[PDB]
Symmetry: none
Subunit: 345 residues, 2 copies
């Protein structure tokens, strides 16, 4: 990927609504770049800037920053904008006859093995176990936690084991309670067993074809095969544990551990685009509505290779999920950069 | 590397005394080989041969077994025959002003990590640690144990920390008490830190040249540099714990859990030479005198990496140790093998 300087007048205009929202989402991450190489003084400048003055935003941007078009190879500046979202699942604080699937916090008999300093070849492996006598042995796999429960507090109860599996894959989500209040859940720990996507088990068993395996297809197969749902979820021996964040309307936290804003946060390649960077996005919704806005690189998703890419966070819930799933849009991306500073490799 | 079938008449001759002692050493493994797919049947046959009848032994071998020259690397059949022994060191059952170095059994808080069913790539490693909160930390390294001790049973007290290091390298030893009586020590466990020969440290410090590194030269350097012994020995972060046996005449036990015979037991590469196998050995003693004999694979040595290699157990005591330390001899090794049975792959 290459950076190609662009005049402020070459970028597409944005409405005042989008300029401010995208500025507010981007400055939202300033509290965590107070001592960042490149963004601290921009932020300090921005901290002074109002957020209800478009003229004052444009001043700050065009005065303090440069713009660079993101180009890859062959398609050049024309890239691909996909989408992602935070799911919301029906559930309860308490077991009922409809909500029987427990979501567990971290067990305190779960021991994290931490021997990387003696054996570097262990980094990235998530080794965990239970200590019985003088031996650290494998922790309970997923199948065993589904049958017998966990030695851990229950943070919430879901209505469908398939909702638990998806929640454990994504690492965060909200639980909708009956009184409309919501529970914030995020990754905390893992049983130490290697992940094995249930999709792959559906291919080997001869139930789907590698190209047919979507989320919507696994869900359809499960609903068609209620007897086999336990076998299916057992095939992934890995089991994820959660923490419950304070109740809040903020969006989930991403890799920058800043609450994502719906419509104004993106997942990028951290190399090509440093986390915290301000971007300019021109693309469309699946229905063709122009999407032209500043957006903040506040999360990670970058396997960039021969074509520009970013993932746009569209919010939480089923409709955000539907919007995010249909996102396959041609788009252009500019990275904004503080003027003096040299850009990154 | 490779097994090259050889005719019996290509093997060098052995005296009747050597043929008898080597048969006897090897036959003593048969008590541990009753469930061996390879050696069980030969052992049943062997049990009925008179160990006082050379002709019956040679008959049994030539009838029921084939001979396979071992070869590896550019030297092919020419290999390296080193030595080991059981050292005997003056010491005490109790701490005195002349015996202050403790020999430890297995600590109560030493946890063995046993996650290989989940990650088969761990299978070579001795992973160990101590549990601190919900974390398995590295256990204290050799240097920390030497300086501060360990929470473990004390088995004996030595006068010189170099003696402990040697004892930890050979894995077995005797401690001579003031009343002439002796106590047996054998390997029981280790702190999980990777071994690093102290010889390598002295070379890295330009104190010895890679060719002069012998046990004699290392001990000489330590004599001349008492103030640097603690840093010399902690350069090997591995620390070995022992078990005490009651004194007895028999040889120490190797990995096959069978008492080793001086001059007729070898430590081998366990994958190339399965424990319990009978071998033919042709080499010399350091003074050049011929050593031609059957020997038994009854211990585990360093794996074969481009050179054929075996460690010859020479017995216990200082004289055995001088012999074992001078052993650096060209050798030929044949593995014997029951007819019809597939070789190891």
């Amino acid at each position: 990927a290459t950076y190609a300087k662009a005049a402020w007048s070459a970028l597409p205009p944005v409405s005042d609504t989008d300029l401010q929202a995208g500025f507010v989402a981007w400055r939202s991450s300033c509290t965590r770049l107070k001592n960042d190489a490149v963004w601290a003084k921009p932020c300090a400048t921005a901290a002074a800037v109002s957020d209800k003055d478009p003229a004052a935003i444009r001043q700050f941007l065009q005065r303090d920053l440069d713009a660079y078009a993101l180009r890859a190879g062959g398609h050049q500046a024309d890239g691909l904008i996909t989408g992602y979202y935070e799911p919301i699942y029906a559930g309860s604080l308490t077991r009922t006859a409809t909500a029987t699937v427990p979501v567990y916090g971290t067990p305190d008999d779960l021991v994290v093995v931490q021997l990387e300093s003696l054996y570097p070849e262990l980094k990235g492996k998530r080794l965990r176990g239970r200590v019985e006598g003088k031996v650290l042995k494998p922790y309970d796999d997923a199948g065993t936690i589904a049958a017998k429960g966990a030695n851990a507090p229950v943070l919430a109860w879901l209505t469908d084991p398939m909702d638990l599996q998806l929640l454990q894959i994504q690492g965060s989500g909200r639980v909708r309670l009956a009184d409309g209040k919501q529970v914030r859940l995020a990754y905390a720990e893992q049983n130490g067993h290697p992940y094995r996507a249930i999709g792959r088990w559906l291919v080997d068993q001869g139930q789907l074809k590698k190209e047919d395996v979507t989320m919507d297809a696994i869900r359809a197969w499960a609903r068609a095969n209620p007897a086999r749902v336990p076998e299916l979820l057992r095939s992934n021996p890995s089991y994820v544990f959660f923490v419950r964040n304070p109740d809040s309307p903020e969006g989930p936290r991403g890799s920058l551990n800043v609450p994502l804003t719906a419509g104004y946060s993106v997942a990028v390649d951290r190399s090509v685009v440093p986390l915290g960077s301000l971007l300019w996005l021109s693309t469309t919704r699946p229905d063709g509505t122009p999407v032209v806005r500043p957006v903040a690189a506040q999360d990670t998703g970058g396997a960039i290779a021969g074509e520009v890419r970013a993932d746009l966070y569209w919010g939480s819930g089923d409709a955000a999920g539907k919007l995010a799933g249909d996102m396959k849009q041609k788009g252009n991306i500019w990275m904004l950069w503080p003027k003096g500073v040299p850009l990154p490799n």
